[PDB]
Design a binder for this molecule. Structure first.
Ligand code: HEM
Ligand SMILES: C[C@]12CC[C@H](O)CC1=CC[C@@H]1[C@@H]2CC[C@]2(C)C(c3cccnc3)=CC[C@@H]12
Length: 464
């Protein structure tokens, strides 16, 4: 007898399990580096911190490109902005500008901390009215960080109950929904194979986004002045003026701002939401954080960046969430700019390269009990200093494409968690429903919405 002719082979079921996991699973069989073919396209998947550090750092510029996806083409207005922009003059300029923007927030009245704290203050005030009730805290958090990013981008914020916030939250939900089904690593190009409305759907969420950004950018051309660089939009216009003409067109500026707005809001919200979930499943850790927040900060004042030097277990909890649930479990896809190599294997010009960050954060030789939420992994055995327990760890990636929002995100997470932990007891709702920790892989790695019982703290009031 005979083997049947094979016309197609995939090593696991599509739309079965999370893909970053299925890829990790195959490491057992094939090693930490291997490739897949779909039509003309080859894709490399990397699942070890050494070979990843080759792609991200050592050969940074070689692998700093982005592949082209019909779905990203829409989200990025034909490859503009930073995130889904390919390497080139376009990317490099807009990346450096945005970065330069961030320094305009290093010291003074527009200290990043002061902008962050104002909003956490509104945010804690709103949340306080719900004393005794179980709420989904998604929207209150989305609001506070929508504000921080808005101030940083434009020097504007939204008053309470402005409907624009609701309009944003909507096309954000609908873009994240139609950007991919599961991860950005779509394996089989299902949307070229059968009739469907997903590009149609995606276009018209992005239309409404682009329309809101167009209003603000034409309504700002007349407020703009050379002697006043205080936000990101200024920085961009300060560049268009001096000069790079092809590079800073209207579309190009809109899209960069659109990336930062998107990225500022959805990543931090998601992580806050994860952190709260892990905290609800871990009442032993939760208790110690209240005890640590009392011993070190008490109730004479609200928490402060300078507190990162003493709220160590809080910073370890955040570190551990960013490990167990990476925001980007497979980063964003890379691409080979020139012919090159990983681990001394050939990788040709144009090949998609994916770092399975999830594998690195779960490597069993690198972590002692990787499947466990254990903020202790990030402390010395006593409890008094933060440690880097493995090199297989890159929540913010690294190299030419590393996260630019990293200082922003770090401070937003630490300050949100600290104000929250000071003022509020956060408990399971009366119906003992805990959130699912499984997650929902999309551009960002999300958690199903859930509810938290929020109460005002006995110790917080017993001091007013
Ligand atoms: C916990 C929150 C965050 C995490 C864990 C995180 C992590 C990451 C990772 C892993 C990447 C991709 C690295 C790669 O593609 O190889 C990335 C890229 C990026 N992030 Fe974040 N990030 C966070 C928050 C933010 C924030 C607050 C912003 C905006 C202020 C932001 C803006 C960006 C942008 C614009 C890129 C694209 C970089 C490029 O293509 O050159 N991120 N981030
Ligand atoms: C789709 C979305 C989120 C929904 C918005 O409507 C549009 C948008 C634009 C830029 C994207 C963002 C999600 C987060 C992205 C993908 C991001 C990012 C992703 C992960 C970590 N850090 C940053 C850089 C650009 C960001």
């Amino acid at each position: 007898l005979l083997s049947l002719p094979l016309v197609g082979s995939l090593p696991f079921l599509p739309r079965h399990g999370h893909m970053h996991n299925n890829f990790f699973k195959l490491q057992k069989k094939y090693g930490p580096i291997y490739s897949v073919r779909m039509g003309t396209k080859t894709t490399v998947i990397v699942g070890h911190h050494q070979l990843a550090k080759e792609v991200l750092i050592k050969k940074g510029k070689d692998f700093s490109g982005r592949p082209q996806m019909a779905t990203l083409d829409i989200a990025s207005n034909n490859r503009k902005g930073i995130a889904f922009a390919d390497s080139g003059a376009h990317w490099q300029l807009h990346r450096r500008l945005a970065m330069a923007t961030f320094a305009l927030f290093k010291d003074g009245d527009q200290k990043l901390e002061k902008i962050i704290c104002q909003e956490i203050s509104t945010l804690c005030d709103m949340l306080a009215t719900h004393n005794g009730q179980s709420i989904d805290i998604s929207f209150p958090v989305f609001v506070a960080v929508t504000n921080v990013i808005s101030l940083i981008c434009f020097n504007t914020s939204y008053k309470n109950g402005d409907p624009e916030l609701n309009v944003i939250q909507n096309y954000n939900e609908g873009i994240i929904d139609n950007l991919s089904k599961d991860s950005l690593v779509d394996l089989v190009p299902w949307l070229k194979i059968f009739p469907n409305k997903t590009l149609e759907k995606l276009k018209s969420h992005v239309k409404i986004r682009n329309d809101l950004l167009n209003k603000i950018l034409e309504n700002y051309k007349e407020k703009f002045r050379s002697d006043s660089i205080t936000n990101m939009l200024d920085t961009l216009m300060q560049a268009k003026m001096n000069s790079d003409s092809e590079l800073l067109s209207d579309n190009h500026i809109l899209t960069t701002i659109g990336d930062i707005f998107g990225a500022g809001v959805e990543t931090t919200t998601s992580v806050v939401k994860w952190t709260l979930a892990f905290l609800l499943h871990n009442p032993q850790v939760k208790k110690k954080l209240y005890e640590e927040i009392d011993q070190n900060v008490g109730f004479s004042r609200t928490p402060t960046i300078s507190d990162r030097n003493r709220l160590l277990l809080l910073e370890a909890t955040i570190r551990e969430v960013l490990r167990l649930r990476p925001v980007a479990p497979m980063l964003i896809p890379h691409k080979a700019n020139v012919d090159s190599s990983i681990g001394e294997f050939a990788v040709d010009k144009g090949t998609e390269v994916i770092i399975n960050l999830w594998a690195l954060h779960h490597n069993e030789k690198e972590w002692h009990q990787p499947d466990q939420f254990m903020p202790e992994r990030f402390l010395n055995p006593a409890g008094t200093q933060l440690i880097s327990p493995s090199v297989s760890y890159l929540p913010f990636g690294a190299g030419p494409r590393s996260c630019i929002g990293e200082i922003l995100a770090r401070q937003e997470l630490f300050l949100i968690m600290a104000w929250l932990l000071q003022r509020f007891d956060l408990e399971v709702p009366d119906d003992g429903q805990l959130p699912s920790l499984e997650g929902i892989p999309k551009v960002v790695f999300l958690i199903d919405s859930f509810k938290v019982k929020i109460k005002v703290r006995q110790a917080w009031r017993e001091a007013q």
